[PDB]
Design a protein around this ligand. Structure first.
Ligand SMILES: OC[C@H]1O[C@H](O[C@H]2[C@H](O)[C@@H](O)[C@@H](O)O[C@@H]2CO)[C@H](O)[C@@H](O)[C@@H]1O
Ligand SMILES: OC[C@H]1O[C@H](O[C@H]2[C@H](O)[C@@H](O)[C@@H](O)O[C@@H]2CO)[C@H](O)[C@@H](O)[C@@H]1O
Ligand SMILES: OC[C@H]1O[C@H](O[C@H]2[C@H](O)[C@@H](O)[C@@H](O)O[C@@H]2CO)[C@H](O)[C@@H](O)[C@@H]1O
Ligand SMILES: OC[C@H]1O[C@H](O[C@H]2[C@H](O)[C@@H](O)[C@@H](O)O[C@@H]2CO)[C@H](O)[C@@H](O)[C@@H]1O
Ligand SMILES: [Ca+2]
Length: 1007
């Protein structure tokens, strides 16, 4: 049962021997002999082709074996295969860490497969650089051979690097070059409020049921409560919160309570709570939120009881829609509407270039208030007005200056870029011809701060340079505007008149406290109060000799000395902060002040004429009575008299006595030292703000920025773009300081008698790190289906799960207290939902079910993998378990080596019988299927063309092709080479053995 050559001691291995009628086969490994005629084909044999198919199957359909999102697969999915083609050569059982890209073994179509091969060649170096591009007409057999070659090469590179890090990067780079897997399939469009290039609305589906909602009532703003009109755009930025969901509404109330009691809650400090809110993005949320905030404020503070009660909590609305004020008034002015008519009148008549400004008359009429003869109180819709805001004529133009100074694309910049753009923006601000800054700021602010029936709001960036550390540099308008502010405190009160003369010149008068009309004789304090303003926007203004400008100061101001507050000069303006050295003018017996093209009593700059300089383009002069005491204060305290209408604010002298300060710019820099922190500096300057008559300080939103760079707000970290609603400089400081700095700023403000406004931002949340599979539809800013998009009811990977530790800690945590103290909040029925809020679920973590939609995420319409007929692959978590065929186990019945009658056959991948072909098995044996498809296993030399020319083969009874071995017969000994072909007429070596074969193949000698 062993065969040795007794003369050499050496054993014969892989040796077929005839002994009489018996044949003995001595095996390859040990030379152990068996009856050759009883060798049987191994029924469990599989081909090398089948071994390859199976190696690449998924190890299992576990979450652990196949990267997924809610069970769905993506173009980025890696998986654990059953086996790894280790080092490109050796199939080896996979470890749990042997993840491989699905795109190594699967492609959505042959085109993408072809493109994959070209990419892996060109950028991966995973095929020879010489090889020709595979084209659209490329053959499947050819694609598969080179796909297998890429795998072999990938495996080789993994073996040498010991890593797949490189392959993660390479594969993702390839993925993003496919339209179906990048922004190109997402219909990028910036129309309307698609600020980030488009939206996907979330829709109900059986495929993503955990993301369903019964709400998502969109665009239900002041003009669209019943949903039967168009309304404002629901979608604006990032992850849109569904504020029509009663559970979300209760969480919005919870958050509002957190802000209003922030000091108590986070610092056990009753001096560090906010006093009012700004409602951000009013026209982009369910208007129910306005009544919800109302009702909370009513219950906590009795807002509607009196002016004294309402005015202790000044609230504002970011409500741009021109129909909003009528509605806000109807619901009780719980938060002050803006007057966007009036701000636009300033834009059209003062703020434009000399060739743009329109007739000044618009200032009188285009407003919630007609100001020709404003001689009454509590008669109009109360409102705030402003000339600029952090995002109104600031952020676009400042980005334009940065683009100009650096040449980088619009809205892209680092800190150095910003500084360089800021230098260009300030130089422009200091020019007569401005490209990026508004014109006539002193005149615009003069209108802002001398208007009756208005709460003016002063913008930080008109006092201090927008970019810089907080309050680091002043604008050219700082002296002008603060002079206006102190002057407003001291003198501005009573009735108002405005008119425009035949020369287009505006006269604006306030009579002083105690006088409503030009004919009122006034009270004690009227005399040295009031103000007279002359404005032109005509840089070429020239009065003809004899023509005049008359300010009708009124019957309280007959035969009276006036002095200038502001006069225009050739190069700028002159400010007078008190009577000293201020030019004077006297009213006549009627109370009229007269100006002409001639100076008054030799006083330079007292003639009316046009100028053009960096301050004034046109004309500005401002006059007040001389001889006011230094402590004169023309403000009115709010009455505690019961209201007789359902309203918080009323437009009257007490409300008018308020000034809001928007105390930030988007372009405040991150502090380099603790002393540079915005909130530190606010705390130190509370008495200064007070001295300007600021009664409420609007702080920036205090939420830590998501820092994700996806919009300006998360580039310059203003606090409008955040993951964690309750994290106010708490996990780490915000741009303005730590939460302790915020609390100290609130306390300092309160010590000075100022209120503080919390910026309430219910519209959206950014940068949620948890992926989620959600059925979506590409849509416009109103959630109208984007008709040309293929993304309609398509599963898409969103970033919707998370919200930070403070949302977790505080989410829904004050609802108990609110229900206990103010049960009436929980029975109110809101007009859009037509139901109450729902405190029964606390939101501690966000997910898709709580959102209306998302900006487009550039993952591509087909990022979530589907079969040809549109069926989604899935582990079975959210829909039917279904995997690509290459990942799945196959039914092996009638495939591979099949016995039929007395013969074995081989059926290929198409269940087709294989004829006249060699097939190798998984352990390296070769078999041959003859021209009738029958395996040859007859142990006799047979002629076969493997292609040219004909060779002599021998197949043992198990079907294996005999190779690299001797066959000793009674008629002679023959040698078959490494290809299983009989050797004739040469000398060969096989290991230590040298064989000489004659022309018939008979062994002549060995050694
Ligand atoms: O004409 C309908 C018009 O209305 C809305 O736009 C408003 C927006 O809601 C306001 O906040 C503000 O910007 O004024 C706009 C004009 O009223 C829709 O959002 C818009 O698509 C639509 O054109
Ligand atoms: O901030 C959300 C707000 O943005 C848009 O409003 C513009 C407005 O159209 C302009 O007049 C400009 O001066 O400033 C605003 C803020 O950028 C939307 O139109 C509005 O509906 C939305 O609430
Ligand atoms: O608010 C006083 C103002 O009212 C009228 O103008 C309104 C007009 O009634 C409205 O339809 C609205 O859309 O805008 C106008 C103001 O911009 C008077 O015509 C006007 O003289 C008066 O100042
Ligand atoms: O065909 C391009 C098309 O795109 C946008 O139109 C949207 C539209 O805004 C939607 O409300 C809805 O009807 O689907 C359309 C896309 O199929 C652009 O607004 C439009 O100008 C343009 O024609
Ligand atoms: Ca919204």
């Amino acid at each position: 049962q062993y065969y040795i050559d007794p003369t050499t001691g050496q054993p014969r291995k892989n040796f077929l021997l005839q002994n009489g009628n018996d044949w003995i086969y001595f095996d390859k490994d040990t030379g152990a002999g068996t009856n050759a005629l009883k060798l049987q084909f191994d029924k469990g044999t599989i081909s090398a082709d089948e071994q390859y198919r199976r190696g690449n199957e998924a190890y299992s359909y576990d979450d652990k074996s196949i990267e997924n999102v809610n069970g769905y697969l993506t173009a980025d999915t890696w998986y654990r295969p059953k086996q790894i083609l280790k080092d490109g050569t050796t199939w080896t059982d996979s470890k749990e860490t042997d993840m491989r890209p699905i795109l190594m073994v699967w492609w959505p179509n042959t085109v993408t497969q072809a493109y994959y091969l070209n990419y892996m060649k060109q950028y991966g170096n995973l095929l020879p650089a010489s090889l020709p591009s595979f084209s659209t007409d490329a053959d499947s057999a050819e694609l598969n051979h080179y796909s297998e070659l890429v795998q072999q090469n990938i495996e080789k590179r993994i073996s040498e690097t010991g890593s797949t890090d490189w392959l993660r990067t390479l594969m993702h780079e390839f993925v993003t070059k496919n339209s179906m897997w990048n922004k190109d399939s997402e219909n990028v469009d910036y129309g309307g409020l698609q600020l980030q290039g488009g939206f996907l609305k979330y829709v109900n589906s059986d495929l993503t049921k955990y993301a369903n909602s019964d709400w998502r009532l969109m665009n239900r703003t002041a003009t669209n409560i019943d949903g039967k009109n168009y309304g404002g755009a629901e979608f604006l930025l990032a992850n849109d919160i569904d504020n029509s969901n009663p559970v979300v509404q209760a969480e919005e109330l919870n958050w509002l309570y957190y802000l209003m009691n922030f000091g108590t809650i986070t610092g056990n400090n009753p001096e560090a709570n906010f006093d009012g809110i700004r409602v951000d993005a009013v026209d982009n949320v369910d208007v129910d939120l306005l009544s919800i905030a109302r009702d909370y404020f009513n219950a906590a503070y009795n807002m509607e009881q009196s002016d004294a009660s309402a005015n202790k909590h000044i609230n504002i609305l970011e409500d741009w829609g021109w129909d909003d004020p009528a509605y806000v008034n109807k619901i009780g002015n719980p938060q002050l509407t803006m007057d966007d008519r009036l701000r636009n009148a300033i834009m059209d008549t003062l703020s434009g270039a000399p060739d743009k400004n329109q007739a000044l008359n618009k200032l009188i009429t285009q407003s919630l208030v007609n100001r020709a003869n404003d001689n009454t109180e509590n008669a109009v819709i109360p409102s705030y007005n402003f000339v600029r805001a952090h995002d109104s004529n600031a952020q676009d133009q400042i980005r334009q200056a940065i683009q100009a100074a650096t040449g980088k694309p619009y809205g892209e910049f680092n800190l150095d870029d910003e500084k360089k753009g800021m230098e260009a923006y300030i130089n422009d601000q200091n020019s007569t011809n401005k490209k990026w800054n508004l014109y006539n700021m002193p005149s615009a602010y003069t209108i802002l701060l001398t208007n009756k029936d208005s709460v003016p709001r002063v913008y930080y960036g008109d006092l201090y340079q927008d970019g810089g550390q907080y309050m680091e540099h002043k604008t050219r308008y700082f002296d002008t505007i603060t002079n206006l502010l102190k002057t407003r405190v001291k003198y501005v009160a009573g009735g108002q008149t405005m008119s425009v003369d035949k020369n287009g010149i505006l006269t604006n008068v306030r009579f002083g406290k105690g006088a409503m009309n030009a004919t009122d004789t006034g009270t004690d304090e009227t005399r040295t109060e009031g103000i007279g303003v002359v404005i032109s926007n005509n840089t070429n203004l020239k009065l003809n000799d004899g023509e005049s400008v008359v300010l009708h100061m009124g019957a309280a101001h007959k035969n009276q000395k006036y002095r200038a507050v502001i006069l225009t000069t050739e190069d700028g303006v002159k400010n007078y902060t008190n009577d000293t050295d201020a030019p004077v003018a006297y009213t006549d017996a009627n109370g009229d002040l007269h100006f002409t093209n001639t100076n008054l009593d030799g006083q330079q700059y007292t003639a009316v004429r046009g100028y053009a300089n960096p301050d004034v383009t046109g004309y500005l002069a401002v006059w007040v009575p001389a001889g006011a005491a230094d402590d004169q204060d023309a403000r009115t305290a709010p009455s505690d008299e019961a209201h007789t209408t359902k309203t918080a604010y009323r437009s009257n002298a007490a409300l008018d006595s308020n000034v809001i300060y928007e105390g930030f710019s988007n372009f405040i820099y991150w502090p380099t030292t603790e002393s540079e922190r915005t909130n530190v500096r606010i705390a130190q300057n509370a008495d200064l703000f007070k001295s300007w008559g600021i009664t409420t300080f609007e702080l920036a939103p205090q939420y830590n920025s998501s820092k994700d760079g996806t919009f300006l707000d998360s580039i310059i970290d203003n606090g409008y773009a955040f993951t964690d609603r309750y994290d106010l400089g708490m996990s780490t400081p915000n741009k303005y300081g730590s939460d302790e700095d915020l609390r100290n700023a609130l306390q300092a403000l309160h010590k000075a008698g100022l209120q503080a406004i919390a910026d309430w931002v219910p519209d959206q949340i950014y940068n949620l790190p948890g992926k989620e599979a959600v059925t979506v539809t590409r849509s416009d800013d109103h959630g109208t289906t984007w008709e040309v998009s293929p993304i309609k009811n398509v599963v898409y990977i969103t970033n919707t799960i998370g919200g930070g530790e403070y949302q977790k800690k505080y989410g829904g945590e004050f609802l108990d207290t609110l229900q206990k103290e103010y049960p009436q909040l929980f029975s109110q029925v809101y007009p859009v939902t037509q139901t109450t809020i729902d405190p029964s679920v606390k939101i501690k973590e966000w997910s898709a079910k709580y959102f209306n939609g998302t900006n487009i995420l550039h993952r591509g319409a087909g990022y979530v993998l589907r079969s040809n007929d549109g069926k989604y692959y899935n582990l079975g978590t959210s829909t039917q378990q279904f995997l690509p065929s290459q990942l799945s186990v196959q039914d092996n019945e009638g495939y591979g080596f099949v016995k039929e009658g007395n013969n074995y056959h081989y059926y290929d991948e198409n269940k087709q019988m294989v004829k006249d072909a060699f097939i190798q098995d998984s352990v390296g044996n070769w078999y041959y299927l003859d021209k009738n498809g029958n395996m040859v296993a007859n142990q006799s030399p047979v002629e076969i063309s493997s292609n040219g020319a004909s060779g002599t083969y021998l197949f043992l009874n198990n079907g294996t092709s005999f190779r690299s071995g001797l066959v000793k017969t009674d008629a002679g000994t023959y040698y078959y080479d490494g290809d299983g072909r009989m050797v004739r007429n040469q000398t060969v070596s096989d290991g230590a053995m040298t064989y000489v074969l004659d022309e018939n193949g008979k062994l002549v000698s060995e050694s």
